[PDB]
Nucleic acid binder design. Sequence first.
RNA 1: CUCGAUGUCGGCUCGUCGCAUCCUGGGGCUGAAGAAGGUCCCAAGGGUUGGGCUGUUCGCCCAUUAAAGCGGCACGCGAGC
RNA 2: CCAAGUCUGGGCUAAGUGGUAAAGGAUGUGGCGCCGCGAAGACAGCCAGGAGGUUGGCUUAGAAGCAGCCAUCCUUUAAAG
Lengths: 180, 174, 136, 37, 138
Amino acid sequence: MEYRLKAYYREGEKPSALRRAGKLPGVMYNRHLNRKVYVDLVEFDKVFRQASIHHVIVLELPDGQSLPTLVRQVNLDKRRRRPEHVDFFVLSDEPVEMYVPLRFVGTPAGVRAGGVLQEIHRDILVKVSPRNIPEFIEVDVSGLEIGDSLHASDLKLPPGVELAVSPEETIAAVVPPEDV
Amino acid sequence: IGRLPIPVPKGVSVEVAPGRVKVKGPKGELEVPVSPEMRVVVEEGVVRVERPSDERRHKSLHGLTRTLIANAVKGVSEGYSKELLIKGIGYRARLVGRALELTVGFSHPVVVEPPEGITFEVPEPTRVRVSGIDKQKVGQVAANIRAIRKPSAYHEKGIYYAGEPVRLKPGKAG
Amino acid sequence: RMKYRKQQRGRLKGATKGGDYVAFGDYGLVALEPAWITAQQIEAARVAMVRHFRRGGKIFIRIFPDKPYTKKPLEVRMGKGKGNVEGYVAVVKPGRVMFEVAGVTEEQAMEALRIAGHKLPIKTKIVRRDAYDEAQ
Amino acid sequence: MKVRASVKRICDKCKVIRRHGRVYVICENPKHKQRQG
Amino acid sequence: KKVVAVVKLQLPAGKATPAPPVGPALGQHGANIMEFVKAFNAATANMGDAIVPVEITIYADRSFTFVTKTPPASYLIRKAAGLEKGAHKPGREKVGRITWEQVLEIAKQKMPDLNTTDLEAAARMIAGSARSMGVEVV
RNA sequence: CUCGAUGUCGGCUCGUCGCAUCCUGGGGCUGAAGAAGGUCCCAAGGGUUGGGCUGUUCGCCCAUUAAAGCGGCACGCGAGC
RNA sequence: CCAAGUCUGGGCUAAGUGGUAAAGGAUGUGGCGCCGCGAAGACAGCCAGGAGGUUGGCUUAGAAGCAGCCAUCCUUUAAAG
């Protein structure tokens, strides 16, 4: 879940004094419906932190509007970490732009295979699924070596079958230590 | 919650004089010093260390006056003698009044002048050490005599306090 | 280092910030308060990692030998055509994304960097992915 | 052993002791007397 | 100088006096090469070609030898298995492989000097230490 | 700053400070047993030879030594040779 | 020293930082976030075991952690190196 505080005083001098207190600027967005609302960090963070809370929405409590939202953008702070601006979207039935967390296992057949190792390339999938996307879409293949790599092709799709990204472009692959 | 608990057994003279907490027991008028804010109590059977704060200085201080004055106590209780064992194939030890005998490095005249609470116990002398008053300076003089010709990590021989399981390093080739 | 077949002689002088911040394996090596950085040196860190890594699980990369440095003379006097392209290195100033893989899992990847970096030329730091990354 | 620099203990038990503004690391192994102050 | 201690040894059953493991080891460490050796003979006489282990000392029971006990895990493993020394590399070589049944069984059999005692326990010990060698389960 | 002038090498005579101390003492460390060594730390006290070849400073060598230090002041010194 | 508070108020240093310096070292000091817990009664102190197939790999002359490159299973509880 998530909760924030409205941005009456918005856009500039505000965002700054914001950072000051420990509140970083934020946007509440839905099709052409927006509110310059402002972020209390400490927790804003804990939350974002879940990361699960970054690939998959949570419920926003603003004034009294327990509604559904995820993040699409975040000017994250050049000069170190912590961002400079957070952006969310509240949904209905049709959520296409889906960056679903994707977990997998090259079913250990790489390291204890050719010493070789595994490089996670995609990790997540921006496909389609109506506010009904699993927090963990997943895939596997005990092939983790040779001139070996795997992609969106093989992929292996869940209940919400819809690839909004490309026709196989490498989920990831295995490269050798000093080779095998 | 603890750095202050100490009783004052035996009608030991335990009282505040000029910034000096006087601890008199077996003639030993040990001086357990007194810092401005420290301060303690002399009640029934317990003497207690108190703290006007608890930053580094005061807390450490607490541990101090508490434990050191404690010393004033157990000390006045008995009288403080330091238990030491000299021991070296090339070494000897005998009192002879007010003097350190000792010889482990030829040309023998190791004649001393035991400070105060000090006196010499020549029980062997492979067993032989010092007796004092104020637990503190006896340890110091003890170490004195100790070090003056003592060590030997590769071949033992010296003066060994208790003798802490003295360590030693090999010789040449064998 | 690398930076084969240029186009030009030698750039010049400036520096202020940049644009690398993401990750690529979670063996996060990030500059902080620099400027130039000798390709050579770079390798230095490169190797460092490479061997610490029980010799194998191959790291990644980040920056490049970027630009052409000239001390021009030899010790001379000055006013020649400032010739000589003696050195090659990167220009990273605002903590840049220096990222590289093996499979240490913990303070060993840590050490590896820690060292490679200590090694490099400046007050800098390191980490892991804390703000995923979205592409098209 | 003196080295106005570094000193990061070592000898497993090797101790870091504050002493008169000096970082003097002390171990029960002579082999580490880390003096740098 | 003379520090007593029962000598734990792995040796060439059938033989008795393996230069390195019983000459130096026993004799100087706290035992005796050839004498403990002929006692060895007394025993190893019918155990000697998959290697034999015994701890020998001058101990209670008022005597010299001590305890003969099942030729250590991994080793008797390859032993019944079918290979000479060690398969040079375990895991990253996945080339020595044995099987379920014959495994758990051989376990049952060697079971003597076996901690506690359990069918699955000994079998598992086999798969595991066997792996330790290159005697992996497959 | 210097060309209406600041006599640039070496040596000589006279030196005077610095330590990053050669020798000295005081040191922990050792892959220190002794003896003697190597290795840092502490500290200028005084001490820091003669010849040869070279205008050489430097250097190589002869014989020494406890040692045979490095370097500042226009690479100190022509109103002193 | 010379004009004008040895003003008041709330910190924070104690080295004299102020009276140049970095790379870099650290139970320096004072301020905030996560992890185990003192009633699954804490940590150092301290008792006591200091588990059985572990003593699996080239090199074994010797790895059988207390040589070095390949493991990372098992038995089994005081627990699990």
